[PDB]
């Protein structure tokens, strides 16, 4: 059973693919019910499956243009109002912005000298407490956040500009 994006969490401006694998940002807000689990301001969506224990892999195909960030979020990530996109808010992610790849550390993001990215493998380890990112062509390490996760952790996707996308690949 492979991951799919959870439409009930998705910001109403996001457009999810029919197969629930891909996400881009739309030009209008869909008329969707506001549900406590739905991100109402930040351009985020979670997968429908979260993890409380064990080790897990998934892969994310990434657009070549700016606008995306992806990784994992603690389930308690704030859904309502404009919120920071930071580890303190329970978001551990890579981001493409200004033509540069970043690990979204705080208060300053960390630039990654990894070269062009096409698909990224995410390795989540809830037994030791880490989430790691690898570029699939050679499995070169991109970044590892070491976190003592204290709750369920969900795959996280965010697209805040048109002209880029993220897609779960399995």
């Amino acid at each position: 059973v492979e991951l799919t994006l959870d439409p009930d969490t998705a910001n109403p401006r996001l457009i999810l693919s029919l197969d629930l694998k891909g996400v881009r940002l739309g030009e209008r807000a869909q008329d969707l019910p506001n549900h406590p689990c739905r991100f109402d301001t930040n351009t985020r969506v979670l997968a429908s499956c979260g993890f409380s224990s064990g080790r897990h892999h998934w892969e994310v195909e990434v657009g070549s243009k700016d606008g995306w960030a992806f990784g994992v979020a603690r389930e308690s990530v704030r859904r309502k109002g404009l919120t920071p996109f930071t580890p303190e808010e329970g978001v551990w992610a890579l981001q493409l912005n200004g033509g540069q790849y970043w690990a979204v550390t705080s208060p300053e993001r960390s630039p990654l000298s990894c070269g062009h990215l096409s698909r990224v493998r995410v390795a989540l380890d809830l037994e030791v407490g880490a989430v790691s990112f690898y570029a699939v062509e050679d499995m070169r390490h991109l970044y590892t956040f070491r976190v003592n996760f204290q709750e369920r952790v969900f795959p996280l996707f965010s697209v805040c500009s048109t002209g880029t996308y993220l897609r779960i690949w399995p």
């Binding site: 301001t41 930040n42 351009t43 985020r44 960030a69 996109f85 981001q95 912005n97 805040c160 500009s161």
Partner: peptide
Amino acid sequence: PHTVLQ
């Protein structure tokens, strides 16, 4: 600026 909603 363009990423405030990320």
